[PDB]
Amino acid sequence: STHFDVIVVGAGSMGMAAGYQLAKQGVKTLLVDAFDPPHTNGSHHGDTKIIRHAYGEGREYVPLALRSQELWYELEKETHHKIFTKTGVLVFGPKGESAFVAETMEAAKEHSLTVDLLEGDEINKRWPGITVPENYNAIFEPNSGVLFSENCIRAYRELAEARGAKVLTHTRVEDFDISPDSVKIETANGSYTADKLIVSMGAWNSKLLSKLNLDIPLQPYRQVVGFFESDESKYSNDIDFPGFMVEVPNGIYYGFPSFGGCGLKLGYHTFGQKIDPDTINREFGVYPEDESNLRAFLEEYMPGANGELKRGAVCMYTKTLDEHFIIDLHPEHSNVVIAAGFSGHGFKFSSGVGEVLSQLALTGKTEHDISIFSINRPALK
Numbered sequence: 001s002t003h004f005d006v007i008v009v010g011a012g013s014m015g016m017a018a019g020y021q022l023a024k025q026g027v028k029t030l031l032v033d034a035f036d037p038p039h040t041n042g043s044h045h046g047d048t049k050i051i052r053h054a055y056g057e058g059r060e061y062v063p064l065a066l067r068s069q070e071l072w073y074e075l076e077k078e079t080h081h082k083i084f085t086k087t088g089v090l091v092f093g094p095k096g097e098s099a100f101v102a103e104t105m106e107a108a109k110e111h112s113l114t115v116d117l118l119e120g121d122e123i124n125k126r127w128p129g130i131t132v133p134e135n136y137n138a139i140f141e142p143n144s145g146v147l148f149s150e151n152c153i154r155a156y157r158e159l160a161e162a163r164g165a166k167v168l169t170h171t172r173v174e175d176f177d178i179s180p181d182s183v184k185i186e187t188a189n190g191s192y193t194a195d196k197l198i199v200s201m202g203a204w205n206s207k208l209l210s211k212l213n214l215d216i217p218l219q220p221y222r223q224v225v226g227f228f229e230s231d232e233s234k235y236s237n238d239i240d241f242p243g244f245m246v247e248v249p250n251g252i253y254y255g256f257p258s259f260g261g262c263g264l265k266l267g268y269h270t271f272g273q274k275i276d277p278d279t280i281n282r283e284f285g286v287y288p289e290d291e292s293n294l295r296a297f298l299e300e301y302m303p304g305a306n307g308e309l310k311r312g313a314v315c316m317y318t319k320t321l322d323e324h325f326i327i328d329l330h331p332e333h334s335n336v337v338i339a340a341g342f343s344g345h346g347f348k349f350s351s352g353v354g355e356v357l358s359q360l361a362l363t364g365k366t367e368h369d370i371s372i373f374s375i376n377r378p379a380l381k
């Protein structure tokens with residue numbers, strides 16, 4: 001019989017940040033998650049996530065990234081959990097053969113961000129361990145880095161509960177019942193109501209937004225990462241090896257320096273198996289590609305980090321058709337906020353999105369420019 005101000009469905013990356021923002025302002029909040037956040041069934045585990053600022057995917061992403069960065073620095077000062085390490089982030093690819101690299105360089109020029117430009121052997125000289133062809137060029141952002149995602153979520157969750165937020169774990173929301181002046185969620189453990197609703201179920205948005213009369217294409221992808229025994233004298237954060245996102249002949253890869261001897265972590269971005277969140281196989285290696293794709297890159301570009309596989313993890317991307325996020329009010333219900341399809345690049349923005357989501361649920365508007373994320377745009381189809 002407890003009526004909330006706001007109910008958040010899915011307390012993951014976006015959800016929990018949104019809950020922290022709401023609780024911090026005294027808004028009576030209930031956060032309902034299918035599991036017990038942070039956990040390893042969604043897309044926030046794997047320990048680390050890259051945060052970059054020269055976002056060539058859209059000028060609106062830059063301010064969002066820059067504001068999110070400031071929010072991560074604030075979070076770092078408020079909790080005892082480790083939030084961010086300034087490893088810096090390196091981007092490289094074939095000179096003149098990478099829209100990604102070129103768009104990154106343009107974004108940095110356009111937004112006056114601080115970056116170092118280098119190419120060929122300069123890359124290989126600056127960062128021992130990296131071996132690229134002399135025809136490769138790179139842009140290095142020294143002030144961006146790595147976020148410890150599980151710590152971020154755990155910190156947001158602890159800060160929000162200390163301010164009165166309620167978290168209902170291991171409870172799957174099955175249906176929604178929206179009325180012009182209140183929202184209701186349906187779960188096996190009971191029904192709950194509030195004045196506002198935030199929906200951020202990650203991969204599961206591809207299966208439950210239909211319950212909100214929304215028919216938006218969202219395709220979940222199985223995306224693995226691998227930790228490899230590496231030459232600590234080259235790939236250790238301690239010796240300044242950077243976080244990275246690069247473009248090679250067969251696609252985009254991303255990785256992290258070895259932290260405390262955990263080994264270099266790498267992930268293949270351009271490819272992932274299409275799956276259903278409820279049946280995805282979360283065992284690293286069940287497929288031969290899981291590991292072969294990562295070693296194909298390592299043996300060629302960072303041969304010193306191609307050692308024994310120390311650890312594997314399986315996580316999910318949820319793509320929209322244009323691969324841009326969806327952050328907006330529900331087209332038929334102004335008391336419902338949607339956050340979905342972060343298509344593999346949304347964690348860095350989660351602190352900012354948390355702010356956008358709390359602004360939208362409380363006022364129906366946000367001070368951030370989120371036009372390219374409209375739920376009514378045509379590219380969504």
Ligand SMILES: *Cc1cc2c(cc1C)nc1c(=O)[nH]c(=O)nc-1n2C[C@H](O)[C@H](O)[C@H](O)COP(=O)(O)OP(=O)(O)OC[C@H]1O[C@@H](n2cnc3c(N)ncnc32)[C@H](O)[C@@H]1O
Pocket residue numbers: 009010011012013014015032033034035037041042043044046048049050051171172173174200201202203204205208223224225254267315316317339340341342343344345346347348349
């Ligand atoms: C998978 C992946 C993603 C990724 C990455 C590497 C890999 C292997 N590297 C990134 C990087 O370097 N930088 C970056 O900015 N992003 C990177 N990503 C993407 C990022 O992790 C994702 O975009 C982000 O985590 C998406 O967050 P979202 O909040 O959408 O998803 P979630 O964290 O999975 O949380 C969803 C929660 O909702 C709950 N749930 C699901 N269904 C229900 C129902 N029915 N009822 C209630 N709760 C539900 C989940 O349990 C989950 O907690």
Ligand SMILES: [Cl-]
Pocket residue numbers: 043316317318319341342343344345346
């Ligand atoms: Cl995603």
